[PDB]
Design a protein around this ligand. Structure first.
Ligand SMILES: CC(=O)N[C@@H]1[C@@H](O)[C@H](O)[C@@H](CO)O[C@H]1O
Ligand SMILES: *[C@@H]1O[C@H](CO)[C@@H](O)[C@H](O)[C@H]1NC(C)=O
Lengths: 66, 47, 97, 47, 117, 106
């Protein structure tokens, strides 16, 4: 029931969170932007960070803000 | 069935096991291969 | 590090340590002879280094010599069952020193 | 015959020899649809 | 039930050959891994050999290797020993051994011993 | 290999809980040692086999234990007929080897 604790507007942070075949994947990208209103007309490629075995029937997600 | 001609306890039948890792088809193998399977000591009375 | 810890917990309070994301040399465990009993049924110790599973839970505790004899499969007695049970069914090497 | 506190104690002493303590660790081995987090190493061979 | 008859005590000149019997009466002979032993007066007993009756093959203990020949005669249900190059120190009482070593059955060491030569 | 016993002779009157230990110099397996009992002017008789694997046909009073480098044979309830000489015996690899012997006296 628990697993490996993994230690590790002027800028835009992009994340793609997908769970595939029980393998949980983190994609991150940091880019500087000046258009604070809406998404810029830019191309960003998301690359893997780490892989993790959660593997459940995820149906909801909460963002957490300070 | 062999209950008629055998099964008295009858221990006559012997089957070879760990002596050979694998084995080619249709050869008869009678080699004793004294104590082989996998170990650091060899060739004696080993437990 | 687990074995060389100064104090182990009592047999009733068996510490459950989850094992993941680490390399285990089962073959070195078998070849090393400081470990007094390395009884094995499930998998051949030479191939053990090769074979790898996802989830391992390891149990640590201390008992008497007689109870080390008593904690054996297919045997009936006092300590074996009463306070910390090892099920008949599990696939898991029993290592005692 | 009333109560009998269940947590009786092992007595360990170096003169005690049938009562000599031996240390046992139990490993449980199981796999369920996850990366093999336990592994066996393989050395580098010179290229 | 099982017993191995002892002979009348023997004295031999050094360098000769001695034959010691080992009788089996009763039970299912040729299944057990028959062995061999002896004990010097005032000294502990020492093992010499092992004979697999079915394949009639034997091995010799290091200290006595090259001097002891062990064979098993299935027809007479007996175990035989041949010792050559006898010296002065070799004199002692000699015993015979049996007990079953099967394969993965455990119980490699067992009694089934007799009385002597 | 040397099978170190406890002790060469123990001069004990009947009834003690006697640990007749045997300590092989190198680890000999925890189901791999055996003890033999020789009656006076006789041939030894097996009492415990495979270190802890209780020999069939034998009463519980004799019981072998231990593992690793230190092994133990236990006498739980000494009886008058238990005075005798006992020999341990290597059961792992290599030729059968016997200890220098322990004579149990009254
Ligand atoms: C692959 C594996 O761990 N198999 C184990 C074996 O090592 C252990 O001795 C036995 C206990 O009875 O349970 C099973
Ligand atoms: C997680 O699983 C273990 C397995 O037995 C269980 O003991 C524990 O109670 C579970 N977690 C919670 C919060 O109940």
């Amino acid at each position: 029931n628990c697993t490996f604790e993994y230690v590790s507007f002027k800028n835009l942070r992009e994340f793609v969170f997908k769970n595939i075949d029980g393998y949980f994947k983190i994609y991150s990208k940091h880019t500087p932007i000046n258009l604070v209103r809406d998404l810029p007309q830019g191309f960003s490629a998301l690359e893997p960070l780490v892989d993790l075995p959660i593997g459940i029937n995820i149906t909801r997600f909460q963002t957490l803000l300070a | 069935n062999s209950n008629n001609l055998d099964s008295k306890g009858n221990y006559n039948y012997l089957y070879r096991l760990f002596r050979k890792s694998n084995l080619k088809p249709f050869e008869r193998d009678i080699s004793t291969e004294i104590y082989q399977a996998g170990s650091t000591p060899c060739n004696g009375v080993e437990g | 590090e687990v074995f060389n810890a100064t104090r182990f917990a009592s047999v009733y309070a068996w510490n459950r340590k989850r094992i993941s994301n680490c390399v285990a040399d089962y073959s070195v465990l078998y070849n090393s002879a400081s470990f007094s009993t390395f009884k094995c049924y499930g998998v051949s110790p030479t191939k053990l280094n090769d074979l790898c599973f996802t989830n391992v839970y390891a149990d640590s505790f201390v008992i008497r010599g007689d109870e080390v004899r008593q904690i054996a499969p297919g045997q009936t007695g006092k300590i074996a069952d009463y306070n910390y049970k090892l099920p008949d069914d599990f696939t898991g090497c029993v290592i005692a020193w | 015959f009333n109560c009998y506190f269940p947590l009786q104690s092992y007595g360990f002493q170096p003169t005690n020899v049938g009562y000599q303590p031996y240390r046992v660790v139990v490993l449980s081995f199981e796999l369920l649809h996850a990366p093999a987090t336990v592994c066996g190493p393989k050395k580098s061979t010179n290229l | 039930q099982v017993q191995l008859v002892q002979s009348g005590a023997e004295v031999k000149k050094p360098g000769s050959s001695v034959k010691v019997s080992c009788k089996a009466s009763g039970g299912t002979f040729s299944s057990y891994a028959i062995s061999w032993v002896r004990q010097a007066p005032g000294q502990g007993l020492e093992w010499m050999g092992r004979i697999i009756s079915m394949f009639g093959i034997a091995n010799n203990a290091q200290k006595f290797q090259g001097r002891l020949t062990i064979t098993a005669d299935t027809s007479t249900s007996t175990a035989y020993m041949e010792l050559s190059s006898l010296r002065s120190e070799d004199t002692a009482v000699y015993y015979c051994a049996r007990g079953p070593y099967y394969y993965d059955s455990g119980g490699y060491y067992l009694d089934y011993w007799g009385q002597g030569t | 290999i040397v099978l170190t016993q406890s002790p060469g002779t123990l001069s004990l009157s009947p009834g003690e809980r006697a640990t007749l230990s045997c300590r092989a110099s190198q680890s000999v397996g925890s189901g791999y040692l055996a003890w033999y009992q020789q009656r006076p002017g006789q041939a030894p008789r097996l009492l415990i086999y495979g270190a802890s694997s209780r020999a069939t046909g034998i009463p519980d009073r004799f019981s072998g234990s231990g593992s690793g480098t230190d092994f133990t044979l236990t006498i739980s309830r000494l009886e008058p007929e238990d005075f005798a000489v006992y020999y341990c015996q290597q059961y792992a690899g290599s030729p059968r080897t016997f200890g220098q012997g322990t004579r149990l006296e009254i």
